[PDB]
Amino acid sequence: DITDKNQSIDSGISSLSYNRNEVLASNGDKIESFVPKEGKKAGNKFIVVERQKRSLTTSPVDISIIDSVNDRTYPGALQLADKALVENRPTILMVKRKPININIDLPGLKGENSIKVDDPTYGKVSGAIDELVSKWNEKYSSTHTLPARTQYSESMVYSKSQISSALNVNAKVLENSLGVDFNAVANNEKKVMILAYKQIFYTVSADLPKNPSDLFDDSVTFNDLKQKGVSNEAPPLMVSNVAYGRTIYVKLETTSSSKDVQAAFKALIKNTDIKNSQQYKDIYENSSFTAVVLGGDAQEHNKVVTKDFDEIRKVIKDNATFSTKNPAYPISYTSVFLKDNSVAAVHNKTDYIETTSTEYSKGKINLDHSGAYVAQFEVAWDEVSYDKEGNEVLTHKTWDGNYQDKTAHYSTVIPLEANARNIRIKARECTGLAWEWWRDVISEYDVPLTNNINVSIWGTTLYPGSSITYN
Amino acid sequence: DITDKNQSIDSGISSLSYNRNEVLASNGDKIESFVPKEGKKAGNKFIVVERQKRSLTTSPVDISIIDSVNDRTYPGALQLADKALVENRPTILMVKRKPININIDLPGLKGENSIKVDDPTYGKVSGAIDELVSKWNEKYSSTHTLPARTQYSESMVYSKSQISSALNVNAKVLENSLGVDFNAVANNEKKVMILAYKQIFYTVSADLPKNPSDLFDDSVTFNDLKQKGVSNEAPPLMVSNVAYGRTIYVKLETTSSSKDVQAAFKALIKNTDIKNSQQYKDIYENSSFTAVVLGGDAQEHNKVVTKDFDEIRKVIKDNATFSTKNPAYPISYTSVFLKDNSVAAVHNKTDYIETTSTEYSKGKINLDHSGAYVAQFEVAWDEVSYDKEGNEVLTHKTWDGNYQDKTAHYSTVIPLEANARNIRIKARECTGLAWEWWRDVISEYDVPLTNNINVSIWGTTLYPGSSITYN
């Protein structure tokens, strides 16, 4: 009852003035410079990258917990709403408290899933929760394990801020546990996909009080609260919901810049036949998969790194069971503002560059002339690039052996760069006055660029023959 | 020997001053305004068009003849080099002439393929040519038909100027004979491909004179020449080469805006197995093929319009033979400047917009819930468009039945627009406290948009089941 006139925990709390939708919000990198299209050579390949700008907005109410077995979050706790909470390390507030009622959502306990906790402390609520679970176990004595409520998330990685908001996890967890090379992703040197299998055993909620005072023992004053950190930019909160279980995170990673990485990946998780295709097996040959289990009942820093996804499938399969007789730890939670008793949400807004690539490979044209006549060739093609504007630039090339007599068995190779386009191969027999009035033995336009383009000409002057194959 | 001091056909001609590389050149539409990317709905489809600017340069020396049997072009004729010549209707010059030597390139007549033509007139050179051909026929009396020297050209159509320079034909011939809808092509309402099978029977050349005077009878004065049209922008020329035969033009046309039209077309001409694929047969169902034969031995305005390419194959096959006993007509020719006796070339330069499209089709999501439990869905997706800058704009949509209990057998359809993207379908069983802590029964992201997306959920509360199929 300071010289402040806010001297009733209720008025002290009610007279707080804050924007509930702006106190817990965080806007990630808001950024602006890039090239729309790009052509890059790397080894025996040509990568074409395209960039769009995208924007993601989120307002999760379910907040991810970092240190599962050290995070002393419990239903009915008091926290401050600020940047610390948003950084997954909220400030707790301890004071003498009035009892609180807790409820667990396990199935088949309707009507007997509540318990009053006189002294609401991490340890004393944990015991109450344990009581509740024992009750369920007493009722269903021969059911020692239940399926976990799995929630599946999936997404490609483009930026630290994009993927965190997308999966609703601290970026540190992905960078540290799965080890995500955000710079490789940025330079499109690696394409990464991240899966998240959230395994919820059950959740426990605390009955919302109709007045902030009902939570606090009467010896606690609004002063003690401000002293503890309550203010306009640090509004008081109560944990109303806590989810218990564990999470399986998976990273699929490749050096392929192929337009089919996401589908190839997708095919592998689903185990659809398409995964046996060869454009996919090639990508799989240059991919690696990592799986880590975080949360309850997992020895910290466990990890699996493989090239055989079946090992990943095993980790997903093995960690979806909930043993009702073994301890469980908080995995996430939701909070309510003490003021209007409304659910607290963390607002995130962030732009990011979305990249889509295509991978081209070097190839060669193989000419074979076994025809009983003199012939001349004309081989031409363009080499594509992209100016700063992302616009195409074509540079015309031609085989130095064009328009030159070739007789009974000639063999050559005309290597092509991975960025070769508008490829045309022509061969004319030499009966007539000149090139312009000579018979076509083979005439191809827009020959698709592959590993090997095999052109062969044979036959007689009267009846030449020819074919073009690919590899 | 006017008051002009140019009084010797040789000096009169030698004192002419002109740019040989600029007198016969024509620059087609040089143009500048367009949108890089565009999204267009048409029926139950969404067409995405992309535009690049391209530039084509040509310098043909072989000049296409328009009216095969009315074109009195003959080896050893005199023409003016100007815009008329470039318009495929050159100005001829007649005067008393000194003899000229002609040579035909038919095989097996080496040493006896020449003849002197005392009075070089269309009719008198035509007879000499006929003499030469009779000589060949006398030598090879039992060979009445020979294969024609076929020259194959192929190209997609983008603009009147682009296709003319590409195929080296008068645009009128394609617009008039094949009937090309250049406005439909422009609005990408029709995709057209044009083939050209030039059938050369033989060519006849005239020996170049070492002096302009040697061509002219001595009674002809430089005055008569100027009077006839010779000038600095109308330099004198002699026809040095004439090709005889006919040409088969083919048009492949479709209303499909599919990214596979060119490959589908290509597959059909080659008759490669890929043509039996279904993405190709669909395109073929919306295509039409036209074939016309121009030139010698064809009744004017003949034409074939079909949906069965085998009919086209027949016209190509049937018109490749050269009957040595039947008359032949000029199909093209080359000219030499009288000044430096150099080969005349028509220089063309033209820009054009190259368009590449992709066709998307409408689809629907089919939900079937036959599970022994209450479930809730979450269906969301974006609808893409493109701003004036060609940039993507995403508009988020959601099924109005999201987050609402659905029980023992529910069925629904969620139609999607052909521009639907980032499609996600989720279903959760309702055991728990709320949506956020409910078990996933199905969770898909980036579901490819097809005709039918069939999602079905069943099973028990403990063990739900689900699947997603496509059509």
Side-chain angles (χ1 to χ4, degrees), chain A residues 52 54 61-62 105 107 147-154 200 203 205 241 243 262 266 270 334 392 394 428 431-433 435-440 443-446 462-463, chain B residues 52 54 61-62 105 107 147-154 200 203 205 241 243 262 266 270 334 392 394 428 431-433 435-440 443-446 462-463:
Chain A
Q52 300 296 313
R54 305 261 145 140
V61 282
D62 183 68
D105 69 16
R149 300 178 200 157
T150 309
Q151 286 186 353
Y152 173 83
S153 320
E154 144 180 351
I200 301 172
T203 73
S205 60
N241 213 317
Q262 172 158 24
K266 278 200 117 101
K270 281 143 158 193
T334 67
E392 284 190 28
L394 302 178
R428 247 121 103 146
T431 284
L433 171 95
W435 170 257
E436 337 278 346
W437 307 285
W438 282 339
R439 196 190 189 153
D440 266 14
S443 197
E444 298 276 333
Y445 302 87
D446 266 25
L462 258 204
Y463 287 85
Chain B
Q52 300 296 313
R54 305 261 145 140
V61 282
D62 183 68
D105 69 16
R149 300 178 200 157
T150 309
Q151 286 186 353
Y152 173 83
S153 320
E154 144 180 351
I200 301 172
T203 73
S205 60
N241 213 317
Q262 172 158 24
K266 278 200 117 101
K270 281 143 158 193
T334 67
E392 284 190 28
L394 302 178
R428 247 121 103 146
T431 284
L433 171 95
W435 170 257
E436 337 278 346
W437 307 285
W438 282 339
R439 196 190 189 153
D440 266 14
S443 197
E444 298 276 333
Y445 302 87
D446 266 25
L462 258 204
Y463 287 85

Side-chain angles (χ1 to χ4, degrees), chain B residues 146-162:
Chain B
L146 298 160
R149 300 178 200 157
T150 309
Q151 286 186 353
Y152 173 83
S153 320
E154 144 180 351
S155 160
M156 294 300 289
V157 190
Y158 297 105
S159 84
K160 211 169 106 146
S161 258
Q162 164 259 340

